Coordinates of all heavy atoms in Angstrom, one line a residue:
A1 N 95.8 168.3 77.3 CA 95.2 167.1 76.7 C 94.4 166.3 77.7 O 94.2 165.1 77.4 CB 96.3 166.2 76.1
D2 N 94.1 166.9 78.8 CA 93.2 166.3 79.9 C 93.5 164.8 80.1 O 92.6 164.0 80.4 CB 91.8 166.6 79.7 CG 91.1 165.8 78.6 OD1 91.7 164.9 78.0 OD2 89.9 166.1 78.3
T3 N 94.8 164.4 80.1 CA 95.1 163.0 80.2 C 96.1 162.8 81.4 O 96.7 161.7 81.6 CB 95.8 162.4 78.9 OG1 96.0 161.0 79.1 CG2 97.1 163.2 78.6
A4 N 96.3 163.8 82.2 CA 97.2 163.7 83.4 C 96.3 163.9 84.6 O 95.8 165.0 84.9 CB 98.3 164.8 83.4
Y5 N 96.2 162.8 85.4 CA 95.3 162.8 86.6 C 96.1 162.5 87.8 O 97.1 161.7 87.8 CB 94.3 161.7 86.4 CG 93.2 162.1 85.4 CD1 93.2 163.2 84.6 CD2 92.0 161.3 85.3 CE1 92.2 163.5 83.8 CE2 91.0 161.6 84.4 CZ 91.1 162.7 83.7 OH 90.1 163.1 82.8
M6 N 95.7 163.1 88.9 CA 96.4 163.0 90.2 C 95.8 161.8 91.0 O 94.6 161.9 91.4 CB 96.3 164.3 91.0 CG 97.1 164.4 92.2 SD 98.8 163.9 91.9 CE 99.2 163.1 93.5
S7 N 96.6 160.8 91.2 CA 96.2 159.6 92.0 C 96.3 159.9 93.5 O 96.5 161.1 93.9 CB 96.9 158.4 91.6 OG 96.6 157.3 92.3
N8 N 96.3 158.9 94.3 CA 96.4 159.1 95.8 C 97.6 159.9 96.2 O 97.6 160.8 96.9 CB 96.3 157.8 96.5 CG 95.2 156.9 96.0 OD1 94.1 157.4 95.6 ND2 95.3 155.6 96.2
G9 N 98.8 159.5 95.6 CA 100.0 160.1 95.9 C 101.0 160.3 94.8 O 102.0 160.8 94.9
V10 N 100.5 159.8 93.6 CA 101.3 159.9 92.4 C 100.4 160.4 91.2 O 99.2 160.6 91.4 CB 102.0 158.6 92.0 CG1 102.9 158.1 93.0 CG2 100.9 157.5 91.7
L11 N 101.0 160.6 90.1 CA 100.3 161.0 88.9 C 100.1 159.8 88.0 O 101.0 159.0 87.8 CB 101.0 162.1 88.1 CG 102.1 161.8 87.2 CD1 102.5 163.1 86.4 CD2 103.3 161.3 88.0
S12 N 98.9 159.7 87.4 CA 98.5 158.5 86.6 C 97.7 159.0 85.4 O 97.0 160.0 85.4 CB 97.7 157.5 87.4 OG 97.1 156.5 86.5
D13 N 97.8 158.2 84.3 CA 97.0 158.5 83.1 C 95.6 158.0 83.2 O 94.8 158.3 82.3 CB 97.7 157.8 81.9 CG 97.9 156.3 82.1 OD1 97.7 155.8 83.3 OD2 98.2 155.6 81.1
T14 N 95.2 157.3 84.3 CA 93.8 156.8 84.5 C 93.3 157.4 85.7 O 94.0 157.5 86.7 CB 93.8 155.3 84.5 OG1 92.4 154.9 84.7 CG2 94.6 154.7 85.6
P15 N 92.0 157.8 85.7 CA 91.3 158.3 87.0 C 91.1 157.1 88.0 O 91.2 156.0 87.6 CB 90.0 158.8 86.5 CG 89.7 158.0 85.3 CD 91.0 157.7 84.6
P16 N 90.8 157.5 89.2 CA 90.5 156.4 90.2 C 89.1 155.8 89.8 O 88.1 156.5 90.0 CB 90.4 157.2 91.5 CG 91.2 158.4 91.3 CD 91.0 158.8 89.9
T17 N 89.2 154.6 89.3 CA 88.0 153.9 88.8 C 87.4 153.1 90.0 O 88.0 152.2 90.5 CB 88.3 153.0 87.6 OG1 89.3 152.0 88.0 CG2 88.9 153.9 86.5
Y18 N 86.1 153.5 90.4 CA 85.4 152.8 91.4 C 84.2 152.1 90.8 O 83.4 152.7 90.2 CB 85.0 153.7 92.5 CG 86.1 154.4 93.3 CD1 87.5 154.1 93.0 CD2 85.9 155.3 94.3 CE1 88.5 154.7 93.7 CE2 86.9 155.9 95.0 CZ 88.2 155.6 94.7 OH 89.2 156.2 95.4
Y19 N 84.1 150.8 91.0 CA 83.0 150.0 90.5 C 82.0 149.6 91.6 O 82.4 149.1 92.6 CB 83.6 148.7 89.8 CG 84.3 149.0 88.5 CD1 85.3 148.1 88.1 CD2 84.1 150.2 87.8 CE1 86.1 148.4 87.0 CE2 84.9 150.5 86.7 CZ 85.8 149.6 86.3 OH 86.6 149.8 85.1
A20 N 80.7 149.8 91.3 CA 79.7 149.5 92.3 C 79.1 148.2 92.0 O 78.7 147.9 90.8 CB 78.6 150.6 92.2
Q21 N 78.9 147.3 93.0 CA 78.4 146.0 92.8 C 76.8 146.0 93.0 O 76.3 147.1 93.5 CB 79.0 145.0 93.8 CG 80.5 144.7 93.5 CD 80.7 143.9 92.2 OE1 80.0 144.1 91.2 NE2 81.8 143.1 92.2
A22 N 76.2 144.9 92.7 CA 74.7 144.9 92.8 C 74.3 144.9 94.3 O 73.2 145.5 94.6 CB 74.2 143.6 92.1
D23 N 75.0 144.3 95.2 CA 74.6 144.1 96.6 C 74.9 145.4 97.4 O 74.9 145.3 98.6 CB 75.3 142.9 97.2 CG 76.8 142.9 97.0 OD1 77.3 143.7 96.2 OD2 77.5 142.2 97.7
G24 N 75.2 146.5 96.8 CA 75.4 147.7 97.5 C 76.9 148.0 97.8 O 77.2 149.1 98.4
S25 N 77.8 147.0 97.6 CA 79.2 147.2 97.8 C 79.9 147.8 96.6 O 79.4 147.8 95.5 CB 79.8 145.9 98.2 OG 81.2 146.0 98.4
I26 N 81.1 148.4 96.9 CA 81.9 149.1 95.9 C 83.2 148.4 95.9 O 83.8 148.1 96.9 CB 82.1 150.6 96.2 CG1 80.7 151.2 96.6 CG2 82.6 151.3 95.0 CD1 80.9 152.6 97.2
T27 N 83.7 148.0 94.7 CA 85.0 147.3 94.5 C 85.8 148.0 93.4 O 85.3 148.8 92.6 CB 84.7 145.9 94.1 OG1 83.7 145.8 93.1 CG2 84.3 145.1 95.4
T28 N 87.1 147.7 93.4 CA 88.0 148.3 92.5 C 87.8 147.8 91.1 O 88.0 148.5 90.1 CB 89.4 148.1 92.9 OG1 89.6 148.5 94.3 CG2 90.4 148.8 92.1
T29 N 87.5 146.5 90.9 CA 87.4 145.8 89.6 C 86.0 145.2 89.5 O 85.3 145.0 90.5 CB 88.6 144.8 89.5 OG1 89.8 145.5 89.6 CG2 88.6 144.1 88.2
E30 N 85.7 144.8 88.3 CA 84.4 144.3 88.0 C 84.1 143.0 88.8 O 83.1 143.0 89.6 CB 84.2 143.9 86.5 CG 84.2 145.1 85.6 CD 85.6 145.6 85.2 OE1 86.6 144.9 85.7 OE2 85.8 146.6 84.5
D31 N 84.9 142.0 88.7 CA 84.7 140.7 89.4 C 84.8 140.9 90.9 O 85.9 141.4 91.3 CB 85.6 139.7 88.8 CG 85.3 138.3 89.3 OD1 84.3 138.1 90.1 OD2 86.0 137.3 88.9
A32 N 83.8 140.5 91.6 CA 83.9 140.6 93.1 C 84.9 139.6 93.6 O 85.3 139.7 94.8 CB 82.5 140.2 93.7
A33 N 85.4 138.6 92.8 CA 86.5 137.8 93.2 C 87.7 138.5 93.5 O 88.6 138.1 94.3 CB 86.7 136.7 92.2
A34 N 87.9 139.7 92.9 CA 89.0 140.6 93.2 C 88.5 142.0 93.6 O 87.2 142.2 93.6 CB 89.9 140.7 92.0
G35 N 89.4 142.9 93.9 CA 89.0 144.2 94.2 C 89.3 144.8 95.5 O 89.7 146.0 95.6
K36 N 89.2 144.1 96.6 CA 89.5 144.6 98.0 C 88.5 145.8 98.2 O 88.9 146.9 98.4 CB 90.9 145.0 98.2 CG 91.8 143.8 98.6 CD 93.2 144.4 99.1 CE 94.3 143.4 98.9 NZ 94.4 143.0 97.4
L37 N 87.2 145.4 98.3 CA 86.1 146.4 98.5 C 86.5 147.6 99.3 O 87.0 147.5 100.4 CB 84.9 145.7 99.0 CG 84.8 145.3 100.5 CD1 83.4 145.0 100.9 CD2 85.7 144.1 100.8
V38 N 86.2 148.8 98.8 CA 86.7 150.0 99.3 C 86.1 150.3 100.6 O 84.9 150.0 100.9 CB 86.5 151.2 98.3 CG1 85.0 151.5 98.1 CG2 87.3 152.4 98.7
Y39 N 86.8 151.0 101.5 CA 86.4 151.4 102.8 C 86.6 152.9 102.9 O 87.1 153.6 102.0 CB 87.1 150.7 104.0 CG 86.8 149.3 104.2 CD1 87.6 148.5 105.0 CD2 85.7 148.7 103.5 CE1 87.3 147.1 105.2 CE2 85.4 147.4 103.7 CZ 86.2 146.6 104.5 OH 85.9 145.2 104.7
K40 N 86.1 153.5 104.0 CA 86.2 154.9 104.3 C 86.4 155.1 105.8 O 86.1 154.2 106.6 CB 85.0 155.7 103.8 CG 85.0 157.2 103.9 CD 83.7 157.8 103.4 CE 82.6 157.5 104.3 NZ 81.3 158.2 103.9
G41 N 86.9 156.3 106.2 CA 87.0 156.6 107.6 C 88.2 157.4 108.1 O 89.3 157.0 107.8
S42 N 87.9 158.5 108.8 CA 88.9 159.2 109.5 C 89.8 160.0 108.7 O 90.6 160.9 109.2 CB 89.7 158.3 110.5 OG 88.8 157.6 111.3
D43 N 89.8 159.8 107.4 CA 90.6 160.6 106.5 C 89.9 160.9 105.1 O 90.5 161.7 104.3 CB 92.0 160.0 106.2 CG 92.0 158.6 105.7 OD1 90.9 158.1 105.5 OD2 93.0 158.0 105.4
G44 N 88.8 160.2 104.8 CA 88.3 160.3 103.5 C 89.2 159.7 102.4 O 89.9 158.8 102.7
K45 N 89.0 160.1 101.2 CA 89.8 159.7 100.0 C 89.5 158.2 99.7 O 90.0 157.7 98.7 CB 91.3 159.9 100.3 CG 91.8 161.2 99.8 CD 91.5 162.3 100.8 CE 92.5 162.1 102.0 NZ 92.3 163.2 103.0
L46 N 88.7 157.5 100.5 CA 88.2 156.1 100.2 C 89.4 155.2 99.9 O 89.5 154.7 98.8 CB 87.2 156.1 99.1 CG 86.2 157.3 99.0 CD1 85.3 157.1 97.8 CD2 85.4 157.4 100.3
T47 N 90.3 155.1 100.8 CA 91.5 154.2 100.7 C 91.1 152.8 101.1 O 90.4 152.6 102.0 CB 92.7 154.8 101.5 OG1 93.8 153.9 101.4 CG2 92.3 155.0 102.9
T48 N 91.8 151.9 100.4 CA 91.4 150.4 100.5 C 92.2 149.8 101.6 O 93.0 148.9 101.5 CB 91.7 149.7 99.1 OG1 91.2 148.4 99.2 CG2 93.1 149.8 98.7

């Protein structure tokens, strides 16, 4: 039923949703007031 997705270390019903902002930054949620803009480095997987 393509509804079982593998998260960073657990299984979740939702995929990793990454939202792109207008200023070139990427955040977890729509509002830039929240999100903890994603980073990258030395391991990939784009962990926050």
